[PDB]
């Protein structure tokens, strides 16, 4: 089975840079076998590149590829926000049909703070035995965050569920929903929940947090 | 599970490029041009070649590939009740050794009589000459140069043959060549491929080493312009006429021989997945290309007689063996370091002969090997038992009537048999069997289905084409005729009987498989016209 | 144009059976070869099995040969794929995929279809409203989805009036569970000058809830 491997696994481009990216099999594969998919999130993979350096129908000319034998890659001239997406090259040599393991592009932006907001359990959740505090973290660059949880001023490490947005198309932001679960006769042999979330941004970490009585 | 493979591509493209390459690449197609308008004449070859001719030629190596198989079993597993196709092709393949090969054997003879400081045909003043020899070529019937009456009189002896029913006697000095002949093919097909396929490389490409020195040579003489001025120059008042169309279209399919049985036994020992639709666009054009050269070979010398020599173009400007045998040996003789041009002229008619005997004999063989592994393990006997047959029936034409023979099986043998065949292949292949079900095939091969212009050649023009050549092929037809001599009505019978005997396979199959088989009629057609394939 | 549309496929016990199927318009089905590719939630493609023109030529992966059987119906125009003794690595978005040929690649996909094998039982959801504890210009607020199975659920706020200031959490698996969140932006003149809504759909449950938000 013919594996292709590509890297970067991920990569950040400014807007008008130059990006690369390459696409490397274990045997020899045909050039006209040789083929580019790009797959934007939520969608359905799209054709892309034929042959290796063929351009399919209403793909822009900024992009461009090449290659031989065991080695390939994907060049785009000037990069744009459309460009944002998965890339997947495929070998059509033999059987079985492989895909790349793909190179996912994203676009660089200036670093933003988070906005950091708690939200303490629901009456309604408060009704069953449960009790879940959540937390959002909204609009910050680059995507790297760290959520810490405490309880009273000691930390808590479990029973925690942590979601990342993909980066938004239009200000190129990431966004996470940190959530702490746990039951309420817990909920109620505390009186203070805080929510604190470090980020490169800021050398202390930026911190919310609530009181239980109010 | 297995079969035996080409070792090498290079070994598959030489015995394509081998057998395709023959004498009618040199004495039919310059010759057809210099007829027909000359450089005009290119635009109907052209436009046969691309419709008719490579569609027909690449169908046949496609179907080699994909179903693995000779002539016999491959149109039986593609169409049961079309079966009988595979056996009249085989029998015409063998009924064409049966002559064909005798040209070789000239050729060779014409060598061997080649190591002199003096050319034997050179003057009149022999004792196998007449009164009435002329140095060179005429228009007059009963007055002959010097090179027809040394072919005639001394190496063939015709003069001592009053027809068809008096033969003679033997050559044995033919017989030698024609033992030589058949022994150099022995021990090329005997191995099979892994020997055919590398020896090929020597005869398929000593004539284009030869031709390229003819053509120097051919080029530095005086008078060469004047020939290339007949042989090429355009004249499209011949272009309206059907019969240059019809000349265009008869060369163009016997030149590359589509649908004879011989491509697909090639194209059967390809890799599965190799590219065939490549294969057959580089070797057709290579044919033809081949053809293109050759008439400057040709009539670069028919000028150089035309001027030094003081002969009328006309007379000198031939068809068939008379060109290689008599007008240009004539030229040669002329020229200083005669031997030398002489001697590489023979033997490249010689190794373009070999190639498609080769190819001829090889359909034959795989045809039977694949349907009776009876005599599959037992090939190195079994050739040996062919060549045999070939030979002792070859020897009525070492005789001095033998070229009466040898006339009869060319315009009857393969001449109407195959057209009629081929016909079938195609009307098999895609009326019955279907493009989509054959264009499905040679995706999974090479990747991607052919074109629809390649879909409409093979269903709707080559239909036509071949039935086009047929048409006026009866229309134009004469009793048999050499020279001033007419052949028997029951000679000709004789022929029709041969061209008939592989035609009536067809039929006979078709009739006989179809009472063999339970059902009803509608329930037994179908089951002979269910692929192998889909039975699985 | 040409449009290729997934449908069947949803929860699967392991070891089941399930047929899959693609509707092919705006083309000659009956040229073209098609093919399956699944997409794992790890988001990897894997090309599965590949049916011919004439579906005369069958290829699989040697990962569900013997399982899954490819099929076609060129008087319908449809693509079959026939699924049994499922495992749950079998988990993923199949797609219906169009190429002839090889050096071409695939073309044309459909929307796909999504494929779940677990042993784990359907179950709604529970939302609950998300509201501050205790400026501006603006607030913020959120809708919690906790406890259900399978996917999908759609969320959106106010019937999907708003679209600005939104952002929805992709739902995480945790002990065969699935929890989801939202939170949504506005201006403290906007809220709680007027009340507010989150909506969220689990078909599979067949769960469709409004909750209101209301300040504490
Ligand atoms: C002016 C004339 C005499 C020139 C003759 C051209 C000769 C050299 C041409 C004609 C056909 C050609 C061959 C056609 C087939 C192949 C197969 C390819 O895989 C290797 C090259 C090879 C073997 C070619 C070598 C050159 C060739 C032999
Ligand atoms: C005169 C000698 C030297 C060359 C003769 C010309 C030959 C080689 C040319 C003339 C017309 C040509 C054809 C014109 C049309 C097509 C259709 C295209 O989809 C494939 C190539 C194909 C099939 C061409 C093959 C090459 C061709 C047959
Ligand atoms: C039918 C198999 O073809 C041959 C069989 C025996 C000897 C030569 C053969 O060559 C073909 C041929 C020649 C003359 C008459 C019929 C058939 C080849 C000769 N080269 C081009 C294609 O036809
Ligand atoms: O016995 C027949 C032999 O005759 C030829 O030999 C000729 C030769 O062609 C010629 O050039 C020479 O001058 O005379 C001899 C015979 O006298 C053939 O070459 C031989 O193959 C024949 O065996
Ligand atoms: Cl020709
Ligand atoms: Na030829
Ligand atoms: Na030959």
Same mark, same amino acid.
């Given at each position: 089975?013919?594996?292709?491997?590509?890297?970067?696994?991920?990569?950040?481009?400014?807007?008008?840079?130059?990006?690369?990216?390459?696409?490397?099999?274990?045997?020899?594969?045909?050039?006209?076998?040789?083929?580019?998919?790009?797959?934007?999130?939520?969608?359905?993979?799209?054709?892309?590149?034929?042959?290796?350096?063929?351009?399919?129908?209403?793909?822009?000319?900024?992009?461009?590829?090449?290659?031989?034998?065991?080695?390939?890659?994907?060049?785009?001239?000037?990069?744009?926000?459309?460009?944002?997406?998965?890339?997947?090259?495929?070998?059509?040599?033999?059987?079985?049909?492989?895909?790349?393991?793909?190179?996912?592009?994203?676009?660089?932006?200036?670093?933003?703070?988070?906005?950091?907001?708690?939200?303490?359990?629901?009456?309604?959740?408060?009704?069953?035995?449960?009790?879940?505090?959540?937390?959002?973290?909204?609009?910050?660059?680059?995507?790297?965050?760290?959520?810490?949880?405490?309880?009273?001023?000691?930390?808590?490490?479990?029973?925690?569920?942590?979601?990342?947005?993909?980066?938004?198309?239009?200000?190129?932001?990431?966004?996470?929903?940190?959530?702490?679960?746990?039951?309420?006769?817990?909920?109620?042999?505390?009186?203070?929940?805080?929510?604190?979330?470090?980020?490169?941004?800021?050398?202390?970490?930026?911190?919310?947090?609530?009181?239980?009585?109010? | 599970?297995?079969?035996?493979?080409?070792?090498?591509?290079?070994?598959?493209?030489?015995?394509?490029?081998?057998?395709?390459?023959?004498?009618?690449?040199?004495?039919?197609?310059?010759?057809?041009?210099?007829?027909?308008?000359?450089?005009?004449?290119?635009?109907?070859?052209?436009?046969?070649?691309?419709?008719?001719?490579?569609?027909?030629?690449?169908?046949?190596?496609?179907?080699?590939?994909?179903?693995?198989?000779?002539?016999?079993?491959?149109?039986?597993?593609?169409?049961?009740?079309?079966?009988?196709?595979?056996?009249?092709?085989?029998?015409?393949?063998?009924?064409?050794?049966?002559?064909?090969?005798?040209?070789?054997?000239?050729?060779?003879?014409?060598?061997?009589?080649?190591?002199?400081?003096?050319?034997?045909?050179?003057?009149?003043?022999?004792?196998?000459?007449?009164?009435?020899?002329?140095?060179?070529?005429?228009?007059?019937?009963?007055?002959?140069?010097?090179?027809?009456?040394?072919?005639?009189?001394?190496?063939?002896?015709?003069?001592?043959?009053?027809?068809?029913?008096?033969?003679?006697?033997?050559?044995?000095?033919?017989?030698?060549?024609?033992?030589?002949?058949?022994?150099?093919?022995?021990?090329?097909?005997?191995?099979?491929?892994?020997?055919?396929?590398?020896?090929?490389?020597?005869?398929?490409?000593?004539?284009?080493?030869?031709?390229?020195?003819?053509?120097?040579?051919?080029?530095?003489?005086?008078?060469?312009?004047?020939?290339?001025?007949?042989?090429?120059?355009?004249?499209?008042?011949?272009?309206?006429?059907?019969?240059?169309?019809?000349?265009?279209?008869?060369?163009?399919?016997?030149?590359?021989?589509?649908?004879?049985?011989?491509?697909?036994?090639?194209?059967?020992?390809?890799?599965?997945?190799?590219?065939?639709?490549?294969?057959?666009?580089?070797?057709?054009?290579?044919?033809?290309?081949?053809?293109?050269?050759?008439?400057?070979?040709?009539?670069?010398?028919?000028?150089?007689?035309?001027?030094?020599?003081?002969?009328?173009?006309?007379?000198?400007?031939?068809?068939?063996?008379?060109?290689?045998?008599?007008?240009?040996?004539?030229?040669?003789?002329?020229?200083?370091?005669?031997?030398?041009?002489?001697?590489?002229?023979?033997?490249?008619?010689?190794?373009?002969?070999?190639?498609?005997?080769?190819?001829?004999?090889?359909?034959?063989?795989?045809?039977?090997?694949?349907?009776?592994?009876?005599?599959?393990?037992?090939?190195?006997?079994?050739?040996?038992?062919?060549?045999?047959?070939?030979?002792?029936?070859?020897?009525?034409?070492?005789?001095?009537?033998?070229?009466?023979?040898?006339?009869?099986?060319?315009?009857?043998?393969?001449?109407?048999?195959?057209?009629?065949?081929?016909?079938?292949?195609?009307?098999?292949?895609?009326?019955?069997?279907?493009?989509?079900?054959?264009?499905?095939?040679?995706?999974?091969?090479?990747?991607?289905?052919?074109?629809?212009?390649?879909?409409?050649?093979?269903?709707?023009?080559?239909?036509?084409?071949?039935?086009?050549?047929?048409?006026?092929?009866?229309?134009?037809?004469?009793?048999?005729?050499?020279?001033?001599?007419?052949?028997?009505?029951?000679?000709?019978?004789?022929?029709?009987?041969?061209?008939?005997?592989?035609?009536?396979?067809?039929?006979?199959?078709?009739?006989?498989?179809?009472?063999?088989?339970?059902?009803?009629?509608?329930?037994?057609?179908?089951?002979?016209?269910?692929?192998?394939?889909?039975?699985? | 144009?040409?449009?290729?549309?997934?449908?069947?496929?949803?929860?699967?016990?392991?070891?089941?059976?399930?047929?899959?199927?693609?509707?092919?318009?705006?083309?000659?089905?009956?040229?073209?070869?098609?093919?399956?590719?699944?997409?794992?939630?790890?988001?990897?493609?894997?090309?599965?099995?590949?049916?011919?023109?004439?579906?005369?030529?069958?290829?699989?992966?040697?990962?569900?040969?013997?399982?899954?059987?490819?099929?076609?119906?060129?008087?319908?125009?449809?693509?079959?794929?026939?699924?049994?003794?499922?495992?749950?690595?079998?988990?993923?978005?199949?797609?219906?995929?169009?190429?002839?040929?090889?050096?071409?690649?695939?073309?044309?996909?459909?929307?796909?279809?999504?494929?779940?094998? =677990? +042993?784990?039982?359907? @179950?709604? %959801?529970? &939302?609950?409203?998300?509201?501050?504890?205790?400026?501006? $210009? /603006? *607030? !913020?607020?959120?809708?919690?989805?906790?406890?259900?199975?399978?996917?999908?659920?759609?969320?959106?706020?106010?019937?999907?009036?708003? =679209? +600005?200031?939104?952002? @929805?959490? %992709?739902? &995480?698996?945790?002990?065969?569970?699935?929890?989801?969140? $939202? /939170? *949504? !932006?506005?201006?403290?003149?906007?809220?709680?000058?007027?009340?507010?809504?989150?909506?969220?759909?689990?078909?599979?449950?067949?769960?469709?809830?409004?909750?209101?938000?209301? %300040?504490?």
């Amino acid at each position: 089975e013919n594996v292709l491997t590509q890297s970067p696994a991920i990569m950040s481009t400014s807007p008008g840079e130059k990006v690369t990216m390459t696409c490397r099999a274990s045997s020899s594969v045909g050039s006209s076998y040789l083929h580019w998919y790009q797959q934007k999130s939520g969608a359905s993979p799209k054709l892309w590149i034929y042959s290796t350096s063929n351009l399919a129908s209403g793909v822009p000319a900024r992009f461009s590829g090449s290659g031989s034998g065991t080695s390939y890659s994907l060049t785009i001239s000037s990069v744009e926000a459309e460009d944002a997406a998965t890339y997947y090259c495929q070998q059509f040599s033999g059987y079985p049909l492989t895909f790349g393991s793909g190179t996912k592009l994203e676009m660089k932006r200036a670093d933003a703070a988070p906005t950091v907001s708690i939200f303490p359990p629901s009456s309604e959740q408060l009704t069953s035995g449960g009790a879940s505090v959540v937390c959002f973290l909204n609009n910050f660059y680059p995507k790297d965050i760290n959520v810490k949880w405490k309880i009273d001023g000691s930390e808590r490490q479990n029973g925690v569920l942590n979601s990342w947005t993909d980066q938004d198309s239009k200000d190129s932001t990431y966004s996470m929903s940190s959530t702490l679960t746990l039951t309420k006769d817990e909920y109620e042999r505390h009186n203070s929940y805080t929510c604190e979330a470090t980020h490169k941004t800021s050398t202390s970490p930026i911190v919310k947090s609530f009181n239980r009585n109010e | 599970d297995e079969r035996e493979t080409w070792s090498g591509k290079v070994d598959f493209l030489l015995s394509v490029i081998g057998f395709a390459v023959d004498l009618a690449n040199v004495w039919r197609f310059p010759y057809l041009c210099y007829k027909n308008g000359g450089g005009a004449f290119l635009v109907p070859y052209g436009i046969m070649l691309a419709v008719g001719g490579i569609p027909l030629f690449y169908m046949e190596l496609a179907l080699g590939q994909h179903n693995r198989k000779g002539a016999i079993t491959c149109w039986g597993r593609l169409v049961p009740l079309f079966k009988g196709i595979g056996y009249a092709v085989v029998l015409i393949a063998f009924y064409v050794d049966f002559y064909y090969n005798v040209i070789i054997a000239w050729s060779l003879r014409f060598f061997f009589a080649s190591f002199t400081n003096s050319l034997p045909w050179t003057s009149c003043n022999n004792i196998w000459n007449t009164p009435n020899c002329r140095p060179f070529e005429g228009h007059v019937e009963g007055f002959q140069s010097a090179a027809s009456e040394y072919f005639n009189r001394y190496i063939l002896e015709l003069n001592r043959s009053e027809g068809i029913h008096d033969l003679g006697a033997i050559k044995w000095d033919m017989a030698l060549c024609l033992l030589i002949v058949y022994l150099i093919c022995y021990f090329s097909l005997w191995k099979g491929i892994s020997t055919s396929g590398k020896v090929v490389w020597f005869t398929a490409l000593f004539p284009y080493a030869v031709l390229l020195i003819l053509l120097i040579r051919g080029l530095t003489l005086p008078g060469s312009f004047l020939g290339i001025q007949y042989y090429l120059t355009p004249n499209f008042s011949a272009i309206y006429k059907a019969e240059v169309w019809v000349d265009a279209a008869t060369q163009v399919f016997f030149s590359l021989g589509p649908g004879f049985g011989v491509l697909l036994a090639y194209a059967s020992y390809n890799k599965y997945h190799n590219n065939v639709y490549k294969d057959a666009l580089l070797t057709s054009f290579i044919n033809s290309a081949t053809s293109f050269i050759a008439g400057f070979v040709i009539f670069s010398v028919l000028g150089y007689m035309a001027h030094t020599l003081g002969v009328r173009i006309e007379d000198v400007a031939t068809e068939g063996p008379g060109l290689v045998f008599v007008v240009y040996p004539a030229a040669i003789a002329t020229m200083p370091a005669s031997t030398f041009w002489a001697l590489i002229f023979f033997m490249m008619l010689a190794t373009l002969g070999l190639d498609s005997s080769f190819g001829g004999s090889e359909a034959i063989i795989t045809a039977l090997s694949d349907e009776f592994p009876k005599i599959k393990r037992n090939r190195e006997l079994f050739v040996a038992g062919l060549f045999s047959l070939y030979f002792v029936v070859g020897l009525a034409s070492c005789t001095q009537g033998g070229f009466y023979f040898f006339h009869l099986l060319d315009r009857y043998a393969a001449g109407y048999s195959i057209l009629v065949a081929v016909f079938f292949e195609a009307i098999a292949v895609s009326w019955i069997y279907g493009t989509n079900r054959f264009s499905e095939d040679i995706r999974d091969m090479i990747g991607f289905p052919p074109g629809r212009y390649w879909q409409v050649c093979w269903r709707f023009v080559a239909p036509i084409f071949l039935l086009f050549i047929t048409v006026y092929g009866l229309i134009g037809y004469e009793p048999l005729t050499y020279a001033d001599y007419v052949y028997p009505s029951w000679a000709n019978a004789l022929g029709w009987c041969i061209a008939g005997s592989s035609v009536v396979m067809i039929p006979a199959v078709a009739i006989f498989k179809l009472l063999s088989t339970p059902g009803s009629l509608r329930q037994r057609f179908t089951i002979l016209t269910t692929p192998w394939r889909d039975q699985q | 144009e040409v449009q290729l549309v997934e449908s069947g496929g949803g929860l699967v016990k392991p070891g089941g059976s399930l047929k899959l199927s693609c509707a092919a318009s705006g083309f000659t089905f009956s040229s073209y070869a098609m093919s399956w590719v699944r997409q794992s939630p790890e988001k990897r493609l894997e090309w599965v099995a590949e049916i011919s023109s004439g579906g005369r030529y069958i290829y699989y992966s040697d990962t569900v040969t013997g399982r899954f059987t490819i099929s076609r119906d060129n008087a319908r125009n449809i693509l079959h794929l026939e699924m049994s003794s499922l495992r749950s690595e079998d988990t993923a978005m199949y797609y219906c995929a169009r190429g002839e040929v090889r050096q071409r690649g695939f073309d044309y996909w459909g929307q796909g279809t999504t494929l779940t094998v =677990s +042993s784990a039982k359907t @179950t709604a %959801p529970s &939302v609950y409203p998300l509201a501050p504890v205790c400026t501006g $210009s /603006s *607030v !913020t607020l959120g809708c919690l989805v906790k406890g259900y199975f399978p996917e999908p659920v759609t969320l959106t706020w106010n019937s999907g009036s708003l =679209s +600005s200031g939104v952002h @929805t959490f %992709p739902a &995480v698996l945790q002990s065969d569970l699935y929890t989801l969140s $939202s /939170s *949504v !932006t506005v201006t403290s003149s906007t809220w709680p000058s007027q009340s507010i809504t989150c909506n969220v759909a689990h078909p599979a449950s067949s769960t469709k809830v409004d909750k209101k938000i209301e %300040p504490r």
